[PDB]
Amino acid sequence: LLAPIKAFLGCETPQSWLQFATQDIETLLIDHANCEKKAAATALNLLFRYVERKELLTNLSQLAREELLHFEQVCEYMENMGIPYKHVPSSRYASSLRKQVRNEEPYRLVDILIIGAFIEARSCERFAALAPLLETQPETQELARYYRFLLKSESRHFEDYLALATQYFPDTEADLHARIAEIRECERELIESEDTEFRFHSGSPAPALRAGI
Ligand SMILES: [Br-]
Ligand SMILES: [Br-]
Ligand SMILES: [Br-]
Ligand SMILES: [Br-]
Ligand SMILES: [Br-]
Ligand SMILES: [Br-]
Ligand SMILES: [Fe+3]
Ligand SMILES: [Fe+3]
Numbered sequence: 001l002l003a004p005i006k007a008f009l010g011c012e013t014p015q016s017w018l019q020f021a022t023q024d025i026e027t028l029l030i031d032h033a034n035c036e037k038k039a040a041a042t043a044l045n046l047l048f049r050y051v052e053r054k055e056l057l058t059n060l061s062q063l064a065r066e067e068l069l070h071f072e073q074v075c076e077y078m079e080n081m082g083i084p085y086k087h088v089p090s091s092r093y094a095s096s097l098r099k100q101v102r103n104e105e106p107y108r109l110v111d112i113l114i115i116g117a118f119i120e121a122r123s124c125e126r127f128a129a130l131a132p133l134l135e136t137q138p139e140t141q142e143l144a145r146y147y148r149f150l151l152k153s154e155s156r157h158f159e160d161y162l163a164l165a166t167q168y169f170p171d172t173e174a175d176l177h178a179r180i181a182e183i184r185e186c187e188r189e190l191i192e193s194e195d196t197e198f199r200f201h202s203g204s205p206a207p208a209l210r211a212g213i
Pocket of ligand 6: 027196197198199
């Protein structure tokens, strides 16, 4: 299941991220909640703009409902875990990737769908990496269960985004691969490079941030 996710991504989640993540479950979960909202937002914006693309309408409308359901599920975990819904401003991740999107159609559309694929792939890999680590303490065992449950969901979302990108790309398969490889390098750098904040999709925690715990 994770084999094609790992092939598609340009790196694994660094061990530095995973070590920090277990020391700030609160930020992890609130940012997770926000990411689920953002994935619904992305899909819905696409439903507004590309009404001629009929497989995108069917698939992404379903996806946006599932993401909203994920949102409600995380909100319930927060309730149950005693976690208030604090203001956590968004990661650098999605906004940086969104800066790569080309203006010219249909490359705009294709880039957005390729980024979707990478975001969903990365989430899937990161949930997978976290789940066994969270399993090790009782107060995070329920979250681990939930993270393993999400894996199937995210894997499908990745596949769907990538399938859409493939069918609406106008040029050769080789041209698609080369563009995917460009976005892969951007995403890899966002994940592996140092990051002074901690979020679901934040990069390798900086010393500054390590000192704070
Ligand atoms: Br859009
Ligand atoms: Br629903
Ligand atoms: Br024990
Ligand atoms: Br291209
Ligand atoms: Br880097
Ligand atoms: Br932080
Ligand atoms: Fe989700
Ligand atoms: Fe998703």
